Design a protein around this ligand. Structure first.
Ligand code: HEM
Ligand code: HEM
Lengths: 255, 255
């Protein structure tokens, strides 16, 4: 476990005040949906996810409050299969886990095993949050435009355009048609993950990449468009630059 | 039309001797399969394709020898649809052509209209040479390895690896899994286009990108593996560097 005040600290992004890990937990427990943003290959993020999950799980189970975990890394189409794994929990062994969940190898198991193991064997159910491969391929090949009010603005789409252009080093002029397709795919992924979170009957934590959890361009906008009255809280695990507007709490690593 | 000796010239790549356009034609007429390699957005290539097609078409039709054109830009799965267009030739007007052929818009019509119009309205039939989108998606998601002797060597695959890496500016280390998928897709495209050419009962010209027509890494290797006794000839429309081993004739532009 990372050492608080030696290895990391936490800011409330609204006030920019440093807040204890315990005090952040007490606040997160108030939320109905907790978004946890990560960099997918970042080891310190993976440790942080276990610490936060463990503290929330312990408190909620001791109160008999249901608490589930949605994963950008599993599709929502997989839920029937995942419910079976939840049912057969005691029958799936640590090395059978990836097969039970039908883990997709686009997501390197190494980068997920620690968190997903702790999640899977607690009282939490794992939810698939995302689009399927087939769904993503279908959007790319051209489907009807996503409707929205705050989540689909030109401003959001352009921010997503430039982020993806930079992520893939794709010249905005040469690669215009491709980038607009990738933007629409991000928008659709965000909508689906929001759909899963908005309709869920138990308190829920999402693990997803930082661009997805961002309050500026991501899932939070789509939750708003769904007209949810759920209390939403966003915790981002920092890497590189920190935009306070992206989240409600940020973990900052030493550094 | 480009002016011979002012705008372009032709080398026999075996001898590196300059050869007249008329003398190249007389040789091409001897072949059963003529591969014509292009750069897809290059205007002078497009003019060159019309000149070569016209000279071959005129000679062969005057002899009542059937002569057809296969296109990397249409899938072989489309043939039933394309045979209907061939049948309804006199009923499809210049502006209905793209709809009759079910043209895929990944290929910019502007870059194909001149050649495809001249082809479509002659006595030639248009053949789909390539994989379908669905076929390409299925290979990407993982299918069983292509078998071959000369066409699937590590040497060929590595050349394709580096070509694609450079074409897309994809760092060989970071993007290793992606590049191997793209290599396998090229290999499959080459195999299918070869399959179409090898089994065709009439003399045939293929239009395809230069990497596909290359005798070093492309379709010619797959034709060999099919054990065809057809006479094969490769004509490349140059751009940038010229590797003599890529083709049997090369058009060189001024320059
Ligand atoms: C994420 C979902 C994606 C899907 C479903 C998808 C699917 C496809 C399909 C079906 C094609 C047509 C294949 C062909 O005609 O040869 C294609 C082509 C292409 N794609 Fe995507 N792709 C995706 C992501 C990406 C990304 C992230 C990039 C950029 C890094 C990209 C870059 C390209 C390029 C440059 C081509 C041109 C094909 C070539 O000549 O190599 N794609 N893709
Ligand atoms: C040519 C046929 C292609 C097909 C069928 C295809 C399809 C796909 C699919 C189904 C995914 C998974 C989507 C996801 O999990 O989000 C994907 C991801 C990806 N693809 Fe391809 N693609 C093709 C070509 C390309 C090319 C040419 C490039 C490079 C220029 C490329 C680069 C990428 C990258 C970087 C991703 C990671 C997804 C992301 O995080 O944005 N693809 N592609």
């Amino acid at each position: 476990p990372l050492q608080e005040n030696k290895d990391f600290y936490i800011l409330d992004t609204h006030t920019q005040k440093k807040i204890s890990f315990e005090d952040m937990i007490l606040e997160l427990l108030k939320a109905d949906v907790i978004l946890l943003g990560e960099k997918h290959d970042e080891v310190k993020h993976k440790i942080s996810q276990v610490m936060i999950f463990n503290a929330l799980e312990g408190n909620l189970s001791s109160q008999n409050i249901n608490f589930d975990v949605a994963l950008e890394m599993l599709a929502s189409t997989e839920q029937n299969h995942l419910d079976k794994a939840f049912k057969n929990k005691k029958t799936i062994k640590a090395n059978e886990l990836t097969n039970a969940l039908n883990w997709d190898k686009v997501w390197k198991w190494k980068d997920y095993e620690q968190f997903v193991n702790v999640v899977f064997y607690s009282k939490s159910k794992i939810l698939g949050a995302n689009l399927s491969r087939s769904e993503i391929t279908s959007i790319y090949n051209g489907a009807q435009p996503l409707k929205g009010y705050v989540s689909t603005t030109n401003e959001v789409k352009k921010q997503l355009f430039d982020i993806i252009s930079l992520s893939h080093k794709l010249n905005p002029e040469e690669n215009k048609e491709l980038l607009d397709k990738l933007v629409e795919i991000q928008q659709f992924k965000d909508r689906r993950m929001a759909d899963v979170l908005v309709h869920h009957v138990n308190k829920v934590l999402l693990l997803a990449g930082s661009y997805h959890t961002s309050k500026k361009i991501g899932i939070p906008l789509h939750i708003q468009d769904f007209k949810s009255s759920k209390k939403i809280v966003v915790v981002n695990l920092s890497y590189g630059e920190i935009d306070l507007k992206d989240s409600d709490y940020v973990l900052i690593y030493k550094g």
